[PDB]
Design an enzyme around this catalytic site. Structure first.
Site, PDB file in Angstrom:
ATOM      1  CE  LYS A  85      -3.128 -44.105  -3.752  1.00 44.14           C
ATOM      2  NZ  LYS A  85      -3.699 -45.192  -2.914  1.00 44.14           N
ATOM      3  CD  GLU A 111       4.586 -33.583   5.772  1.00 42.00           C
ATOM      4  OE1 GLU A 111       4.482 -34.070   6.918  1.00 42.00           O
ATOM      5  OE2 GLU A 111       3.684 -33.680   4.913  1.00 42.00           O
ATOM      6  N   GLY A 155       0.096 -46.519  -0.508  1.00 41.93           N
ATOM      7  CA  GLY A 155       1.412 -45.926  -0.340  1.00 41.93           C
ATOM      8  C   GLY A 155       2.428 -46.828   0.344  1.00 41.93           C
ATOM      9  NE  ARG A 156      -0.903 -49.275   5.317  1.00 40.56           N
ATOM     10  CZ  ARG A 156      -1.904 -48.405   5.199  1.00 40.56           C
ATOM     11  NH1 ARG A 156      -1.649 -47.120   4.966  1.00 40.56           N
ATOM     12  NH2 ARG A 156      -3.164 -48.832   5.268  1.00 40.56           N
ATOM     13  CD  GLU A 185      -0.099 -44.910   6.997  1.00 42.84           C
ATOM     14  OE1 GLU A 185       0.130 -43.821   7.570  1.00 42.84           O
ATOM     15  OE2 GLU A 185       0.168 -45.099   5.790  1.00 42.84           O
ATOM     16  CG  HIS A 202      26.945 -54.769  22.098  1.00 40.80           C
ATOM     17  ND1 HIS A 202      27.905 -55.270  22.971  1.00 40.80           N
ATOM     18  CD2 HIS A 202      26.972 -55.564  21.000  1.00 40.80           C
ATOM     19  CE1 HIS A 202      28.467 -56.321  22.401  1.00 40.80           C
ATOM     20  NE2 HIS A 202      27.922 -56.510  21.225  1.00 40.80           N
ATOM     21  CE  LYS A 205      -1.908 -35.974   5.895  1.00 35.46           C
ATOM     22  NZ  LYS A 205      -1.996 -36.376   4.460  1.00 35.46           N
TER      23      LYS A 205
END
Ligand SMILES: O=P(O)(O)OC[C@H]1O[C@](O)(CO)[C@@H](O)[C@@H]1O
Ligand SMILES: O=P(O)(O)OC[C@H]1O[C@](O)(CO)[C@@H](O)[C@@H]1O
Lengths: 555, 555
Positions: free
Chosen positions: A210, A216, A271-272, A357, A388, A518
């Protein structure tokens, strides 16, 4: 804080302190043959049915009425309209919140700054489809004339999880598309292991970001480009193997990507909440644009349900208030999402960002610090496996864990004449039944005796075989997990998250909680170079850094 | 009903409600330059170093002193000895707990009712290695003479998770082994999509099941067997394509698998503690036996560290008590596991069973109902990926979440001259620092003023930019993620879990909580057959079943 001051909330609170504790599911079901009928909702989308059964929850008509009164007094409906009308409800960033606009198939106008948003939306969608057709058809060739065989999406936040989850969820619909890969972590093994299986001549990279400034993603993009040009040798060839999905034209161009190779979205696209925008290019590429439009339609259907349905029969509203009940009255820290579908193995992880978030906040829209709990910790693994691994703690642990069980009636793979699915469905049903019913001392004792246990074994095992039950769950059953149904399911939860945000009076659409990490990271990066010890931090950070410089050498 | 009345436990409790909310990490580091030094331990295993830095925890010498008194006060040491000595500490099932025997490289005798177990232990290891050797060298041929190219492990829970997590984490060490697949879910989709990529002629199926009766695994196994026998038709060919890892010889033989093809383990091997036994065959096949032995050696090293180290310097003990501190005093429901390593993407899922299925109990060894919290909800995703998903809630949410950050100093893929790993390490360090230090209103205000924001905008945003910090974390740093190191890390957590179980006086090695679901599942399974409505259960289970029957054939 608005919530704790609200009279509907307080009434809810005192009722809980003087009743809630005695609520017992097994008892509630035994004394009300209409419970399922009174606490369930069936939705016909014309493209499959969705059954939301919330009858196995610790509630009654009275509790639901109070919960719904609270939703009403907290302005849920007005808040919803403001979102849909394009108002800048994202108060801290002064931005509109229009993911619903991205899938507004009705194309009814939505104006933000005096301008209708839909034309731009559809424009990108057309661009996306046209591009997808060329790549799929083989029309789009690499720098050596070969057709694209692998599409690699490089993004991290809402720029990775959604596209990854949906492509995994809809594998059965990816017949004529290339192989899609997802690179996200800055951790070098991620991009390295991927590029190792690729031929630069037939590989197409999608830089999803975005902002297009996330370290990254940019670092990963740059690494992919270096690796590419190592073979292509001509920077001009980049325009055939790299496209970008972003809202930052400058950074994209600055990266070296041709502007016609940019599929943009807007600042009001969180973004999400972005898989519905250009970010979903890799999905469209994987399942075809028709299936992608089905995805959008399913969400559109859910958006309409949320917008036009009275609160008491409103799915997302019901889920939300059921959560508020458990979070704010029972104080449950978590929310488990358990889909009995291997294809949805990344569903829970997607909503960890979507939910956490969004509502992992502590400041209200007025600037006041909350004096109550907000967003829960979302987690889970696909069914039956989880059975399990951790259900042991859910059944006989010390934590109350609200669980959402999801499952498609019809499987995408009816092998062995449906034997596997039949068993999967049996477990799906039995688990919420078991959580609800439990098993008393007496029931256990009779089983042990009937099984032929000796007076010693029985006496030894008895207490350990007792299930207190009374563990609440939601059962969401849908005809089939199709692109449309999945689309509606995601939107349903997106709206659940919205409602809860409104009740708590927090901004479910910003995320300032990520800034501190950050900036501190930027400070440390240059300090890692060299073997000189560091001492500009607290003794822990310094110690960790010095250990790293020391062990960097070790053979 | 044992810990709550323990002198040290109560003393610990009183201190907390009196001082607990006074502890402040930032203040603790600002006033003690030796904090890191005093609250961290370095471990030299001769095959890499492991630094456990627990200084960013809300503790002081006094608190740690009280926590350790509780450890010895609850008989952790005697309990430890009983396990290693081969005593039947799994009381409800009257079984020994000897996963430590599986990796007992020194071969010191460990006798269980009768004989020393090491002889049979090494016997299987030798068998595994010889088979592994034949399969990888190409000696072992498929029924049409081809070397096997794909190994499909079929198991669930403890029989799938350890193998899957370890092979994923040790991908760099596979060079030379066949490709490994893991089928686990009964959901037809899992085996269906796996089989569609295999050649029956070069596929080797591994049926992993301790009991060899679980429904998911046997069913998956029959489907695979049919699938195979569909193209080979000769039943006798099965002997070259199916082997079994189990403790049940009879059932293995009844399934149609010859003895020679069975790699057995024993009842004192807990499923969630079994990857160290025959269950690890797929690990050995994938990375070679030298690496497998290395994995066991690492565990063995940690086992010895745990057994011979004074509590105050004992890694698993320290992790366990810090956990007890947050669980029983701060009331934290969860434990986040955040490895900054993409290869460890299944590490958290693995311990969801190892931890949760072990300590998700509520009945003490004496048969009493606990009146305190037990095991936590384990969860997490590899960093930084997470940093862009749920860290928002960890930083500015309303819940205290103990976090274990893990990372190797040296990466397996030092691409771009270590640039990616440098950034990864920077984030690893910066995150715990941020969680610790936070950012005050005063600091945030200065920041906003420097950004030249008007008084209005600044104050409306200010509270949203504040990080209260004081979020506790553990930082576990190791030289490199090698087979040996992973083994020690896994064993370290196995023992953290053991200690905690001891303190809570629960049986960390049984799992009766999964029985109810299984019983109920077999009950409704046959009821799903047919179109007739079911009315034998609560209205919800009935309603869900009838919705399923109705939609089963909907188009
Ligand atoms: O697509 P971008 O702009 O690179 O964002 C990365 C992700 O991280 C965040 O900015 C915060 O974690 C998200 O909101 C986003 O989805
Ligand atoms: O097939 P197996 O190896 O007997 O075990 C089934 C798995 O599920 C459980 O029985 C319970 O979840 C585990 O303890 C075990 O690892």
């Amino acid at each position: 804080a608005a919530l704790t001051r609200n009279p509907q909330f307080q009434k809810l609170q005192q009722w809980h302190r003087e009743h809630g504790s005695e609520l017992n599911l097994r008892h509630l079901f035994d004394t009300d043959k209409e419970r399922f009928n009174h606490f369930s909702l069936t939705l016909n989308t014309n493209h499959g049915h969705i059954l939301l059964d919330y009858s196995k929850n610790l509630v009654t008509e009275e509790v639901m009425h109070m919960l719904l009164d609270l939703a009403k007094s907290r302005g849920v409906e007005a808040a919803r309209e403001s979102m849909f009308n394009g108002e800048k409800i994202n108060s801290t960033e002064d931005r509109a919140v229009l993911h619903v606009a991205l899938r507004n198939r009705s194309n009814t106008p939505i104006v933000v700054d005096g301008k209708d948003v839909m034309p731009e939306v559809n424009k990108v969608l057309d661009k996306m489809k046209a591009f997808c057709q060329r790549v799929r058809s083989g029309d789009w060739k690499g720098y050596t004339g070969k057709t694209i065989t692998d599409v690699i999406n490089i993004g991290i936040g809402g720029s990775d999880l959604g596209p990854l989850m949906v492509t995994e969820a809809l594998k059965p619909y990816s017949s004529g598309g290339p192989r899609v890969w997802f690179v996200s972590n800055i951790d070098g093994t991620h991009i390295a292991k991927t590029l190792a299986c690729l031929n630069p001549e037939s590989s197409l990279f999608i830089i999803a970001s975005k902002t297009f400034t996330t370290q990254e993603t940019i670092t990963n993009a740059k690494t992919a480009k270096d690796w590419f040009l190592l073979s292509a040798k001509d920077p001009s060839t980049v325009a055939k193997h790299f496209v970008a999905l972003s809202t930052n034209t400058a950074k994209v161009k600055e990266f070296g990507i041709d502007p016609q190779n940019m599929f943009e979205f807007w600042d009001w696209v969180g973004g999400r909440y972005s898989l519905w925008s250009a970010i979903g290019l890799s999905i469209a590429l994987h399942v075809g644009f028709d299936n992608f439009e089905q995805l959008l339609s399913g969400a559109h259907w859910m958006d309409q349900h949320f917008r036009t349905t009275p609160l008491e029969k409103n799915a997302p509203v019901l889920l939300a208030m059921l959560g508020i009940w458990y979070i704010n009255c029972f104080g449950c820290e978590t929310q488990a999402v358990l889909p009995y579908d291997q294809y949805l193995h990344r569903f829970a992880a997607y909503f960890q960002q979507g939910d956490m978030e969004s509502n992992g906040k502590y400041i209200t829209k007025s600037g006041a610090r909350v004096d109550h709990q907000t967003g829960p910790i979302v987690w889970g693994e696909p069914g039956t496996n989880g059975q399990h691994a951790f259900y042991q703690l859910i059944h006989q642990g010390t934590k109350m864990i609200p669980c959402d069980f999801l499952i498609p009636v019809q499987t995408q793979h009816p092998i062995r004449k449906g034997l596997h699915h039949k068993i999967l469905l049996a477990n799906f049903l039995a688990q919420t039944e078991a959580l609800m019913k439990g098993k008393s001392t007496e029931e256990a004792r009779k089983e042990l005796q009937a099984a032929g246990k000796s007076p010693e074994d029985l006496m030894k095992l008895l207490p350990h075989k007792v299930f207190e039950g009374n563990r609440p769950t939601n059962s969401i059953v849908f005809t089939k997990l199709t692109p449309f149904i999945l689309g509606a399911l995601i939107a349903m939860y997106e709206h659940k998250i919205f409602v809860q945000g409104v009740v708590w009076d927090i901004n479910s659409f910003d995320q300032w909680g990520v800034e501190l990490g950050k900036q501190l990271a930027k400070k440390i990066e240059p300090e890692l170079d060299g073997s000189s010890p560091v001492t500009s931090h607290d003794s822990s950070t310094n110690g960790l850094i010095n250990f790293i410089k020391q062990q960097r050498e070790a053979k």
